[PDB]
Write a protein that binds this DNA or RNA. Structure first.
Lengths: 70, 128, 178
RNA sequence: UGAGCCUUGAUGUGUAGGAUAGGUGGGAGGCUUUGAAGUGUGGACGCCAGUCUGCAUGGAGCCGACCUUGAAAUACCACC
RNA sequence: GCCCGGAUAGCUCAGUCGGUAGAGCAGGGGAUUGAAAAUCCCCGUGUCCUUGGUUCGAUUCCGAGUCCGGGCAC
RNA sequence: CGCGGGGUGGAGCAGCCUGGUAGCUCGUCGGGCUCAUAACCCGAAGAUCGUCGGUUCAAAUCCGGCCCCCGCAACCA
RNA sequence: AGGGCUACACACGUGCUACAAUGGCGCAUACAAAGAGAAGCGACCUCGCGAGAGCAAGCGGACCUCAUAAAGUGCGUCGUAGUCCGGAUUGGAGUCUGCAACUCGACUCCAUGAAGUCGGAAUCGCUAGUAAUCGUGGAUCAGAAUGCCACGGUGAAUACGU
RNA sequence: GGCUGUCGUCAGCUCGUGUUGUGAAAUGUUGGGUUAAGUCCCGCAACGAGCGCAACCCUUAUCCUUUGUUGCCAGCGGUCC
């Protein structure tokens, strides 16, 4: 949204992505598909994968320190 | 001799303030002006503003629908607006920007988009 | 492809006038390496135009190029499924080159007697907004007007931006990410 | 709320023309508590600033009549 | 055999209260893509059916007849 | 028996109503793209209208005879 | 020895020359590099429309000769008409090299004089002394060069961007 | 056999030795940055090296140097210029 409670005059700096409760980017998951009932086991249970990506970054600082990457 | 100025025959109804609704979707965007008490005062659309093809779902086409519509309500002497925004299309914010640049004052940009509480089954489109 | 951006060899100024733009014009009039021929055909044309009307010689020449100058041009970035062109601002140097080129293209297919009359009419007509290369500029402006901007890989541009820590924003543009 | 019949009020923005050209005869002007005009304020108002004009104010002329332009000329009363 | 109502871009319609020749699609060229399907572009043609007539000039405004389409006739 | 319809470039179809007029989609052949074929693109070729006669200035067309293909009909006690 | 590879219904690759006026034609006029040459290249001379001829100097290669650099510049000319464009063809006369030019040579000249109005689908080469375009030399080679190999003249578009 | 065309002037291709893997094998030759380049720097169970890229080579672009005719002529003399 641009947001309707910010204060009511048109001030055009407001970035709609940096102003969204939820809209678009998950909210219309429910259109032009039914996410087949346990399709989510392979769509959404890649939570482990994105938690691994955070682990990998948190590792990678340390290996660069002991190896002297620069 | 005479070569004309006035844009249309003299004004009708005359309500001073209104609500606009922009139904923005993936294929087309519709801009419809109403009264506070629920009455269409006029509309225009991207497809009716002579785009067609892939151009029909573009922020630039959305803008030109809004300015066309703004002409149709000049007969109602409107000056102030509130706007309802409706759907996941492009043109969704870009239509608003054209309304403020039309010289209209916009009171709220209330996004309304209709969301099932889990509700009815969507079609399953793009299939394998 | 192309590692290194460099270009532009430097031209010698025109001998009669000392001008750079006329010396560029005689090159794009030049068939099959004959510079001394192109020179004469241009000067006899230019003098016909400046005697017809022009207190300064380069007055009516400069406005001739001004009416056929194309502001924006239509490029294709291949979305596929039938692309439909994308306007780009024509850079001032490439603005001059498109403009000079089109007058001479038109002159070369006039079919009147001698390239000097063919060229003099085609400048004369385009100075006064009725030429063969007025039309081609107007046709390019019509295709540019209709195809006012739209572009592709919009989704990929925002995620390639997110992969380089680039902002939550995207807009229609050419040959590259948005 | 349609329509007819019908009572009063009205628009006709061409080309040239100051603007005003619904067809057309009369017609040299109309003066209750004037007929002023005119600047001003709003309304209708449309082949855009061009007509009519509530009315503040003003009791101090519209304007043709061979005044001019134009095939037709205007004011002003009929006709439709 | 009457009353009707139409007769134009190739087509249907129509800017056409007489002062004034168009929209939609049709064929060619240009501009782009796995030519194409498909964008965008610039031309598309009429003495408005043949004849009378009002008039400052009018196709249409008022009229007589040919052909098409719709009724009642027999 | 009988009546009516049909006989077109290598294939299927059109034009057949006193007539002069050969068209479409396939297939074919030549060129092109492709490593090569398929497809795709461009160009071209192909019917002396079943057959014989007659009327006609002129006939695929109209008319008559024969062969060939189809539809219907070949009963009533 | 003679014939053949050099045929012809046709299909294709490569290149030349062209369809024109930025030109073709005429006459005058300008400035190159690189190379080859005692089985050879050959001036000057006089003769030939010309290809060529004969007479004859010279050269061993910075010297002499092939060798008149062409496009360009000057001036005149032609007028969009398949023409003062194009020259394919074929007749006729002629020259040379060589034993001999019929099959199966090159070139001169007179005459004649086609397709061709920039090419369907497709499609290729190039980034700057390049492409385009103009001429010159050489290898082979008695005699056949548009080819191949090299030399120099004039000299461009554009490359944003992936 | 020789020779040559091609992928391609692509920049890759691999040996010793040490190590990890039952083994085919990997490692180095991967990472970070940079380049025409496996180029070079950094940095690691890989350490070293060879083919290859670059370089030398010729040629062209200046300038100096020496030579000075069969080349050249600025000055100089003479001059049919």
């Amino acid at each position: 949204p641009v947001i309707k409670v910010r204060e009511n005059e048109p001030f055009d700096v407001a970035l709609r992505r940096f102003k969204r409760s939820c809209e678009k980017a998950g909210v219309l998951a429910e259109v032009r598909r039914r996410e087949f009932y346990e399709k989510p086991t392979t769509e959404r249970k890649r939570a482990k994968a994105s938690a691994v990506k955070r682990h990998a970054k948190k590792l990678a600082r340390e290996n660069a320190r002991r190896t002297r990457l620069y | 001799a005479k070569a004309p100025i006035r844009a249309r025959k003299r004004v009708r109804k005359q309500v001073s303030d209104g609500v606009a609704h922009i139904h923005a979707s993936f294929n087309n965007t519709i801009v419809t002006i109403t009264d506070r008490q629920g009455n269409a005062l006029g509309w225009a659309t991207a497809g009716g503003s002579g785009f067609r093809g892939s151009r029909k779902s573009t922020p630039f086409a959305a803008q030109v629908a809004a300015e066309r519509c703004a002409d149709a309500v000049k007969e109602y002497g409107i000056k102030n607006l509130e706007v309802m925004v409706k759907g996941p299309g492009p043109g969704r914010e870009s239509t608003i920007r054209a309304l403020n640049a039309a010289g209209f004052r916009i009171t709220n940009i209330t996004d309304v988009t209709p969301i099932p509480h889990n509700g009815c089954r969507p079609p399953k489109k793009r299939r394998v | 492809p192309r590692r290194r951006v460099i270009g532009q060899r430097k031209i010698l100024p025109d001998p009669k006038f000392g001008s750079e733009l006329l010396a560029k014009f005689v090159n794009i009039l030049m068939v099959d390496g004959k510079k001394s021929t192109a020179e004469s055909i241009v000067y006899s044309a230019l003098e016909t135009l400046a005697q017809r009307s022009g207190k300064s010689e380069l007055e009516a020449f400069e406005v001739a190029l001004e009416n056929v100058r194309p502001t924006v041009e239509v490029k294709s970035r291949r979305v596929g499924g039938s692309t439909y062109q994308v306007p780009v601002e024509v850079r001032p140097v490439r603005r001059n080159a498109l403009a000079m080129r089109w007058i001479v293209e038109a002159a070369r297919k006039r079919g009147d007697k001698s390239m000097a009359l063919r060229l003099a009419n085609e400048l004369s007509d385009a100075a006064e907004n009725k030429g063969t290369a007025v039309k081609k500029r107007e046709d390019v402006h019509r295709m540019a007007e209709a195809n006012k901007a739209f572009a592709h890989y919009r989704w990929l541009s925002l995620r390639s931006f997110s992969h380089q820590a680039g902002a939550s924003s995207k807009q229609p543009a050419l040959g590259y990410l948005n």
